[PDB]
Design a protein around this ligand. Sequence first.
Ligand code: HEM
Ligand SMILES: [Xe]
Length: 212
Amino acid sequence: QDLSEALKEATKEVHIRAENSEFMRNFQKGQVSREGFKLVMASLYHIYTALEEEIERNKQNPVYAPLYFPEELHRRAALEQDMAFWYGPHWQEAIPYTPATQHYVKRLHEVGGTHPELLVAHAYTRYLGDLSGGQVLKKIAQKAMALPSSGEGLAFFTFPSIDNPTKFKQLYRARMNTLEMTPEVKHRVTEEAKTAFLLNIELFEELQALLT
Ligand code: HEM
Ligand SMILES: [Xe]
């Protein structure tokens, strides 16, 4: 079984639970205000920063290298732009760093520093999601909060270096299947992906609690 197939199958159930979490539900209903949106985007800033720091650390490692696409996928730069938009010039010392976000970042550094062979699970969970649900969320965000088609405030959801997301995802899945795979690694990579989804679910549950 190809890694891409194993991952889709391993996370199809938890994905249903994630996309139907209370926070995503309210978001899809346009009931989230500037406050909630700023909270989640700030959390993603911390998460992608940690993820990409670990990707850079392991870019030359064959257990990840084939998936090294900073120009097309990395979000830190976009998030820095979005943070400046929503939080202003001094966003640096203004954005929050919630416990659930810290927990996610912690696991990211553990994976990147001690179990790099599992980093693909985290890149897969974040980036493939961004190229999917993230695109529908972008349109919902624009409508609900009156964000211009121009893109300001939604740089995170914009991939200027990717012409066709559907096509890129197919290329990304194919490349995922070229990584050195053993029953051992495939087993743990799919487990870490489920873990990644859970960390996301926990972040959302925490943010929803903080907002209500
Ligand atoms: C706002 C709720 C969400 C919506 C509307 C949504 C919707 C979708 C859609 C339409 C697909 C299928 C795309 C395709 O087959 O090419 C997809 C795939 C995916 N989503 Fe989501 N999603 C949501 C939340 C999430 C979350 C919270 C994550 C984890 C950060 C996530 C991660 C993924 C991944 C990793 C895939 C690719 C699965 C695969 O092909 O192996 N999604 N999503
Ligand atoms: Xe989001």
